[PDB]
Amino acid sequence: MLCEIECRALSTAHTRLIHDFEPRDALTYLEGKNIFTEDHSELISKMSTRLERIANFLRIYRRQASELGPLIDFFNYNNQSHLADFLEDYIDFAINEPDLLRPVVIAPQFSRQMLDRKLLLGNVPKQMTCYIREYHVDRVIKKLDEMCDLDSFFLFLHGRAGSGKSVIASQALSKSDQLIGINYDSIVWLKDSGTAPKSTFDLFTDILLMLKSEDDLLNFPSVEHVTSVVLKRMICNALIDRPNTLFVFDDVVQEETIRWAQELRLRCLVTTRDVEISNAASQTCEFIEVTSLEIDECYDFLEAYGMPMPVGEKEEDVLNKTIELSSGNPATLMMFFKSCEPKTFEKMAQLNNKLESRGLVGVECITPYSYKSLAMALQRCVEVLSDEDRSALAFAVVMPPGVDIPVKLWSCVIPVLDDEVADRLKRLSKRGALLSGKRMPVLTFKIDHIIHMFLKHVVDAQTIANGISILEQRLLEIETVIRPEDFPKFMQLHQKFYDSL
Amino acid sequence: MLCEIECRALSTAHTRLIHDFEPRDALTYLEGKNIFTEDHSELISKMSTRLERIANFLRIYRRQASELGPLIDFFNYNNQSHLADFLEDYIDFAINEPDLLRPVVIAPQFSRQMLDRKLLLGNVPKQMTCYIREYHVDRVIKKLDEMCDLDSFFLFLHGRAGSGKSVIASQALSKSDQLIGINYDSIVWLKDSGTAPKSTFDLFTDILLMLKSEDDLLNFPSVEHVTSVVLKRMICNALIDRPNTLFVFDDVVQEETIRWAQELRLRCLVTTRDVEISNAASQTCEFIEVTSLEIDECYDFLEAYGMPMPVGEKEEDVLNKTIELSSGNPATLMMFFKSCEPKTFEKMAQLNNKLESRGLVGVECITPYSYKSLAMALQRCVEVLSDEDRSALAFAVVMPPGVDIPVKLWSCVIPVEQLDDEVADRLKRLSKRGALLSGKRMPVLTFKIDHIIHMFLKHVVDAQTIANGISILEQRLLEIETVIRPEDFPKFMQLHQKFYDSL
Ligand SMILES: Nc1ncnc2c1ncn2[C@@H]1O[C@H](COP(=O)(O)OP(=O)(O)OP(=O)(O)O)[C@@H](O)[C@H]1O
Ligand SMILES: Nc1ncnc2c1ncn2[C@@H]1O[C@H](COP(=O)(O)OP(=O)(O)OP(=O)(O)O)[C@@H](O)[C@H]1O
Ligand SMILES: [Mg+2]
Ligand SMILES: [Mg+2]
């Protein structure tokens, strides 16, 4: 055999071996330099046209010669030195010059390549135009290039529900023309939502078909009936073709799906609500959290969608009302714009009210989200919890939202040393991100408003009157500052908040 | 047919028959040396790609030639002597010079990028990164190289449940680049869990497909309906292609599965809870036990996963609490880390408590194990026991865990002339069928019971059945530290009243 460079030279010099070069002329000389067999020679010497005696002379040559020499020592001898010189020069700018082009651009316009073509068969969705989160979309791409060498790995883009985890993939894959082509060769993107015990197999049924190209979606058999093991090994098969290929698993909720991408040794990205699905993986597991929208970042998001900026004082405040409500949440923001009809501080403030008094359902819209209001979405990240975690949850309604509070101070309204309350609470601000893991000054959690007006218009009416009474019970006996235990027996600073019941 | 060495040479020299070798070139010459049929020849001469006219030329060749000769007497004639020479050398370091074959005509092609390949397709799972048990992973690989010559054999990697038997295979196969390529040519890895009377056939249904390459997973017929005998002989068929091939049978529990790998004369590794499945084998049966984690080894496991080391005294003790609890058990350890939230001696000691008072379910996690808590796992190794062994088991809760005690001293709480030699008999069947106790011979025939293998029982046996074993204890109990408690002082088990209080 030869190699990519030695075969690449017979590739490069081709509109020349088309114009002038009779193969027969070389047969006698190459049956001799022992790079042919008499069946070979005649096999090529009796062809109808030359494009045959040439394509056959080339295909057959790249097999027999211990190198490319006994062919330049022929174009020289055949009055065709003008050929053997080109090929000589090509051997020189490869073995003497250790450089040619690097995987880059001499065939430009990846604008429908890396874009359109490669992305659309990855089923990547349209990236976002009118706002882009730098910080994160950047960090991601970075943590990708870092691993494009690695042989299998898990990138967890964990975050809040509806909080815009998927858009950043569509952006961080569509923005940079390196990830596709350069770092990774192809892309395959599947939304999971594996709830069933069968969704997680079936996902990797449609991946196998995401792989299987036009190469028989007709011959698509009864894939539906195959063993877990057969489909799996039958993907290892289909994988020869797609080396350095990247999977996006938009919205995973089953941990079996992750068990699967590590059984299969897959390079994958994951967008998920629940983070602990990563324990199923003993691997290069690296994560990027998707914070509630920073107080500065949101502002920018606003003007991005022609949304008016504060003139006075208690009008930016009647905007801080909204950032306070949608405690940093893209999708519940988008439901707003879409539903801020006039666009005045006026009609926005009508809504700040519809919210305190109709929860998330008071903005329920046709947002580009696959959900009406957030409530529809959250409903799920709820039913997933343990019947025990579920209980301890819907009780922590009765609270100060956007207020930082001690563990014992929570122990009062919660079911079961109150070290176990501490335990559930963390399982929560982890399994769908619902609170706050704050270590110092003192082991305290929080509860945002979005993650509240959901609860608010969702828990059985009596269950609130009950949590509040259960509050006052303990509550007795013997601003940038956490409220100490010199003054716990009264939660009266927040009587204010507590009035709204 | 040929054989493992004659077929192993066409296996070894393969990134060469990929780079340069047209099968058609050999058809005319082999229809002639009478090692083909005209249907055969055209059958291979009209293929779309060469990887076909090559895989078909190889599969078909290993059938027709009384030996491998009429193929080296061709690569010589086809200007491809650089091939026929490799294969000549390979015949030489097998029929003349034993041994020199692996160092010489095999290693200079070792490719660490080709493991990975071989491995993904053996369905070997990702080896473990952040901790590796030297002692064992090493011993294994050793006991493998020892047999890569042998024609069929059983390596039993027996051990406790969840105690990390399978990880060591993924490591001992993925760490050393000799086992794959050098010692053994290819690898096939299947998790058994054969409970049904049909799981054990079906396993060897999916192996047959593990073998059958892209060569018709489309044409996969109604394999489901074939006789035991036909599938079996139909694997002997499929085996011509995979000589020196290694099977891993992650977690076997049916002994029929072993009857099968010895009917088939298979080179296999086995990870298992129950050890007696080896009696079904009259063979080179060699075993490696997987001990509870050594008291030093565990420590290392800890720091491996950024876990804090003892500053004071009764804080390493409130670590020795945990090693004492998970009486050397990887998977029940992993459930811990995953669930040691802050990571302080504090929050770890909260858990030392959740354990004494919620058994294994007090750490039940999403560990990389295929089980929540160990309990889910053990449940099985339990329902396997004989209804009689099952009884004698759940009674030996009422005990001192991590305490070494006499047989008669057990005879008291256990079911069944007048000689308690039968208690002795069940107890051994136990620390063998899932490893549950302790086979200690001298000073005196005594067993033990670890804590993990206890807080399972603890939160599992019917409440009354404990109040009952304890009363049944005191009954006999009367009548007429590095030292076993003698029989001068048996009538009182009061040293362990301490332990016994927790009831
Ligand atoms: N420019 C933008 N960048 C990021 N997110 C945006 C942008 N514009 C709007 N969004 C909001 O995010 C919504 C969809 O977000 P996304 O699907 O990423 O959330 P998610 O966290 O993936 O939720 P899930 O995984 O549960 O579907 C949009 O319909 C919109 O409400
Ligand atoms: N080297 C290791 N590093 C970290 N964790 C380990 C290691 N070995 C074992 N474990 C623990 O054990 C789990 C898998 O254990 P393993 O599969 O080895 O046990 P097993 O004896 O095979 O049980 P079974 O026979 O039922 O498969 C891991 O998810 C982890 O919790
Ligand atoms: Mg989405
Ligand atoms: Mg296992």
Curated annotation (Swiss-Prot), chain A:
Boundaries of every CARD domain copy: 1-91
Keywords, alphabetical: Apoptosis, ATP-binding, Cytoplasm, Magnesium, Metal-binding, Mitochondrion, Nucleotide-binding
GO biological process, one term: positive regulation of synapse pruning
Chain sites annotated for binding ATP: Y131, G162, G164, K165, S166, V167, R273, T367, Y369
Entry GO terms, CC: caspase complex; cytosol; membrane; mitochondrion; nucleus; perinuclear region of cytoplasm; protein-containing complex
SMART domains: CARD
Cellular location(s): Mitochondrion; Cytoplasm, Perinuclear region
Protein name: Cell death protein 4
Effects seen without this gene: Mutants exhibit a block in almost all programmed cell deaths that normally occur during development. RNAi-mediated knockdown causes a defect in egg laying in a small proportion of animals. Also causes a moderate increase in CEP neuron survival in response to high Al(3+) levels. In an ain-1 mutant background, enhances the proportion of animals arrested at the larval stage, with egg-laying defects and with a ruptured vulva.
Sample GO molecular function, one term: cysteine-type endopeptidase activator activity involved in apoptotic process
Main location: mitochondrion
The organism's taxonomic lineage, starting at the top: Eukaryota, Metazoa, Ecdysozoa, Nematoda, Chromadorea
